[PDB]
DNA sequence: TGTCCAACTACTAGACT
DNA sequence: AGTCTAGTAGTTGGACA
């Protein structure tokens, strides 16, 4: 457009920084980048309609809806259907927003309103499963296709409805389901794959792409390259599986002969989301790291054998220098922090925060390492920094207790939950912070603390035989699943 | 461009042994 | 205790108004 039109845009944008959404710059950048110009003007236009009854959406909910292709249509449609969906279909507001927060949002909402009753009633699905189906790019297409094919996939193919729901609940779910219908016999008969294995391949974005690529490339990979089919499955059962498989074919020689790696290793690098990026990056850096960084092949393999493997490997080559030299951690400690999904992130946050955390909070490099060295390390590091102060002082914990709660997967979630529940658990139900610490000092610390507090709030008679000191042991032994499974058995 | 649909890459969390 | 797996965010490409 023209300069005048720009200025209006920048001005409707500015009006959004105030009432009633009070959007910040990050949020406006999200809407512009993901929902486009129209999405931004739409939000501005309907802002009072959306933040008031009967919608009562949050500024964050409005953003999640707007930030997609067609956002404006999702927003328009959301104001039309949310009340009917919540009131007449039992859906919650969060659920309607989850359905709305994907490209084609408007088509998915209208289709749920139309098909939810038939899906739940004539195929025994729950509202929770209809929502998981609808809540992808293309949701309308997945929903209509489950309606057409769920009977034949079950009768003529022996899949369970759960399996048909898992196949449908991805972007491209319509494609995945028609493909499974097509190739499930062939892949089992001609290739010796179990139905369960076809389902695993099909249950990711581009599931159709992966099934077709398995049907093609499986022979060459097995017969020529010698791979087991089970290893071909494992490669394919990931986002962008077809790219993984194409890439293994190409690089399986150049990596097993030139760089000496074993087929067993190349498979482990491919069997993750973005496995193609992983392989090509190992190809390109194995010499560079095993000569100018003193890193063994095995270490390189372990670094690359996780989703985002390419990101971690490049982040290692770039920071193994400084982190050792300027901070002091051994190639062992750097290889550990990188050896997780999101490894690149944990590495950059340890670049940043090793000094601040030690200087302002008194932590060791060894502690810092222990916190960065889990999936989502970045998120635990940034939360220790943030909350360790209040946790130690408002809540009477030690710095080391705080490190222990941070030192598992979901450390960020475990920390925030303690700062939320620790009060009621000691005050209301008189629980020693030593107990609460130990329930949270495990993976799944968040849900286990939520589960235990549900019980001490509204006791189910199903758990009567278990004293509170027992519930704590269970929560510590196996967390939520341990509480939920004890409930199941009466 | 705007909208819908599909597919790929990466990150974060909880769970299963 | 390292792992396997689901959930999801962010982005890109094809297709067609």
Author numbering: 233 to 722
Reproduce, without paraphrasing, sentences from the article in which this PDB structure was first reported.
Transcription activator-like (TAL) effectors specifically bind to double stranded (ds) DNA through a central domain of tandem repeats.
As a proof-of-principle, we generated two dHax3 variants, dHax3-NI, in which Ile34 was introduced at repeat 7 to replace Ser34 for recognition of base A, and dTALE (standing for designed TALE repeats), in which the RVDs in repeats 3–12 were replaced and the protein recognize an artificial DNA element (5′-TCCAACTACTAGA-3′). Two structures were determined for DNA-bound dHax3-NI at 2.8 Å and 2.2 Å, respectively. The structure of dTALE in complex with the target DNA element was refined at 2.4 Å resolution. The structures of DNA-bound dTALE can be superimposed to dHax3 with an RMSD (root-mean-squared deviation) of 0.946 Å over 455 Cα atoms with the major deviation occurring to the amino (N) terminal helix. These observations corroborated the notion that DNA binding by TALE repeats is modular and context free. In the PthXo1-DNA complex structure, Asn34 is hydrogen-bonded (H-bonded) to the N7 atom of base G; in the high-resolution structure of dTALE, however, the side group of Asn34 donates a H-bond to O6 atom of G. Given that O6 atom is more electronegative than N7 atom in base G, the H-bond with O6 atom may represent a stronger interaction. Asn34 form the hydrogen bond in a different way with both A and G. The length of the hydrogen bonds are about 3 Å.
